[PDB]
């Protein structure tokens, strides 16, 4: 069946965020007037949390566990979908089509994505999503 659904984990293959891992917030298979092709609204990690060793202090761990997010309208041809899924209730409808039409809405959405992703990373789950791809 279809695999490019909500909570699908993909890899961005083109643009500034090439090689980054994203989660599909919303699939737009039939396209829109602005983007007349199959595309997706996705949220991803721009700067990954750093590696944490057992002798670090709490302040250094808290400093190195910070995640910088991003949001993107992306063509399906510029995604490499994976078998992994990432289901977060806090990311439900965090972005939509006219979010990208206003810079403050992008900032609020990125704040929400950063908070939710940092909660999931501190949970210890979904470690493949928060480790960077090596290429």
């Amino acid at each position: 069946m279809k695999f490019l659904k909500t909570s699908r984990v993909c890899l961005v293959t083109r643009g500034r965020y090439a090689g980054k891992k994203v989660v599909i917030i919303q699939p737009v298979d039939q396209g829109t007037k602005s983007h007349p092709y199959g595309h997706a609204l996705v949220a991803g990690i721009e700067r990954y949390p750093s590696k944490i060793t057992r002798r670090m202090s709490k302040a250094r761990i808290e400093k190195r566990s910070k995640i910088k997010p991003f949001i993107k309208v992306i063509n399906y041809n510029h995604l490499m979908p994976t078998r992994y899924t990432l289901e977060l209730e806090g990311l439900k409808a965090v972005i939509n089509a006219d979010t990208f039409k206003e810079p403050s809405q992008r900032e609020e959405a990125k704040k929400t994505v950063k908070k939710v992703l940092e909660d999931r990373y501190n949970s210890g789950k979904n470690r493949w999503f928060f480790t960077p791809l090596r290429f």
Binding site: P49, K51, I52, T53, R54, I61, Y121, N122, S123, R127
Partner: peptide, 29 residues
């Protein structure tokens, strides 16, 4: 309790795998 973010990354030192560790090479100096 230990930090869940701590990870074990074992290295395999077989042929064709990861770089060999620094051993005592005093016999062949």
């Amino acid at each position: 309790p230990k930090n869940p973010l701590l990870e074990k990354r074992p290295r395999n030192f077989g042929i064709g795998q990861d770089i060999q560790p620094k051993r005592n090479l005093s016999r062949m100096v």
